[PDB]
């Protein structure tokens, strides 16, 4: 009764504090990145920014007529259906992961907003081998309590910042099931993005696409 | 819609090559990502620097410095065809450097059915002197006493209505 | 349990339930002023307007 009310209050206070800790880091992250270029450009010196540990990959081609080498890869990245899209750890072992199925997926670096909307609106956690929606934070805690992940924002923080528990969190996230984009694709969708198509590495433009896909 | 892109980059430093040289390019691309792709294509075909050993230090976009000032642009290009090599030099008069290239893509794919990948832009330069201009129609367009009725008289004022099926009077068009 | 999924990005009550920090967020931050310090390298500007 009163004891759980205190437990409710203190736990809720902790989640609010963690959330404000992350967004304070979030704002501080962009601020320095702006000041880094501002200082470098003022000096005439050139500055290159940090690499992305986060990559979002959307499968854009159907399951018909796909080579077996590419079929297995799609199984590993859990893109079993067209329009599916998951968070992957952008590393060297994923460079070739997305070169073999280069024509079948468009992938790019998600900003904070895209990662936020996807879990809030399309966030389903693989719990007990079931696709249970993240209706409340207790579902995440009952599944990710060991990894010190409690609420959605902690889960969002562990994803965006690509923390030590990125693998367990992204594995706990059921492959987001997106809708065919509002407004449509380019005409020739199945060409490379750099060539006027919509396949392959489109860099930040995933953040300009996933808005259409929700 | 193309944009001017000053693209500067170098190869990855190593113990053999501690200080790579900063190459620079002023190439056009509809977005930042295409600029990287054209950069690697332009350089690898020429200087043979591998993709995986290269990083890019800065992508900047150059707005037209004086867009309101009319200018004549000289454009050296290299046609790729069945032969694959043609030193073609076209000239266009317009206001924006990007706008001139757009038309050059418009004319190259219209007059000669070229393709963006096939055509590589060699150099785009301003032609500040009428004497430096070499085209009679541009020379005639540069004359002090330019004067001509608005061509394609129908294209002016066209029909000027939403869906004007069954107009009640003949159009003057004059 | 959870008969329906109510969109947190459109339902304020669900949003507060999920995130107990959205109450005090204060998005539009007046971090700057009219006093914008335009800082650009002159050599950077020159190499920008090259060719």
């Amino acid at each position: 009764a009163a004891e759980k009310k205190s437990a409710r209050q203190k736990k809720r206070e902790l989640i609010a504090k963690r959330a404000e800790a992350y967004e304070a880091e979030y704002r501080a992250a962009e601020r320095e990145q702006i000041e880094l270029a501002r200082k470098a450009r003022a000096e005439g010196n050139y500055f290159v920014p940090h690499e992305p540990k986060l990559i979002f990959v959307v499968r854009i081609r159907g399951i018909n007529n796909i080579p077996p080498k590419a079929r297995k890869i799609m199984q590993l990245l859990r893109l079993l259906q067209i329009n599916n899209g998951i968070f992957v750890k952008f590393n060297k072992a994923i460079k070739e992961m997305l070169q073999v199925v280069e024509p079948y997926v468009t992938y790019g670096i998600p900003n904070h907003k895209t990662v936020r909307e996807l879990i809030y609106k399309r966030g389903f956690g693989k719990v007990n081998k079931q696709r249970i929606p993240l209706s409340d934070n207790a579902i995440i805690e009952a599944a990710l309590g060991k990894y010190s992940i409690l609420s959605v924002e902690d889960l969002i923080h562990e994803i965006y910042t690509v923390g030590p528990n990125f693998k367990q969190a992204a594995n706990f996230l059921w492959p987001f099931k997106l809708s065919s984009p509002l407004g449509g694709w380019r005409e020739r969708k199945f060409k490379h993005f750099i060539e006027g198509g919509d396949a392959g590495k489109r860099d930040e433009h995933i953040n300009g696409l996933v808005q259409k896909m929700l | 819609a193309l944009k001017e892109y000053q693209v500067v980059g170098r190869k990855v430093p190593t113990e053999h090559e501690p200080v790579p040289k900063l190459f620079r390019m002023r190439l056009f691309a509809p977005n930042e990502s295409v600029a990287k792709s054209r950069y690697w294509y332009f350089l690898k075909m020429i200087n043979k620097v591998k993709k995986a050993t290269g990083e890019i230090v800065a992508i900047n976009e150059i707005s037209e410095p004086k867009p309101l000032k009319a200018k004549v642009f000289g454009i050296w290009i290299r046609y790729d065809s069945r032969s694959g090599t043609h030193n073609m030099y076209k000239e266009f008069r317009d206001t924006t450097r990007v706008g001139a290239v757009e038309a050059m893509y418009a004319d190259m794919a219209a007059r000669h059915r070229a393709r963006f990948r096939s055509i590589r832009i060699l150099k785009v330069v301003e032609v500040e002197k009428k004497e430096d201009v070499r085209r009679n129609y541009v020379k005639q367009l540069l004359n002090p006493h330019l004067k001509f009725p608005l061509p394609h008289r129908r294209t002016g004022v066209v029909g000027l209505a939403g869906k004007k099926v069954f107009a009640p009077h003949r159009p003057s068009t004059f | 349990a959870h008969v329906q999924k109510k969109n947190p990005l459109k339902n304020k009550a669900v949003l507060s339930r999920l995130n107990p920090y959205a109450k005090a967020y204060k998005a539009n931050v007046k971090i700057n002023s009219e006093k914008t310090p335009k800082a650009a390298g002159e050599k950077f500007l020159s190499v920008l307007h090259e060719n």
Binding site: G44, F47 | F42 | -
Partner: peptide, 19 residues
């Protein structure tokens, strides 16, 4: 890759064109 500065002192960039 990690963030670092590419000093341009004695490493000035000269523009390139295709051939």
């Amino acid at each position: 890759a990690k963030a670092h500065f590419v000093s341009t002192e004695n490493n000035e960039p000269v523009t390139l064109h295709p051939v």
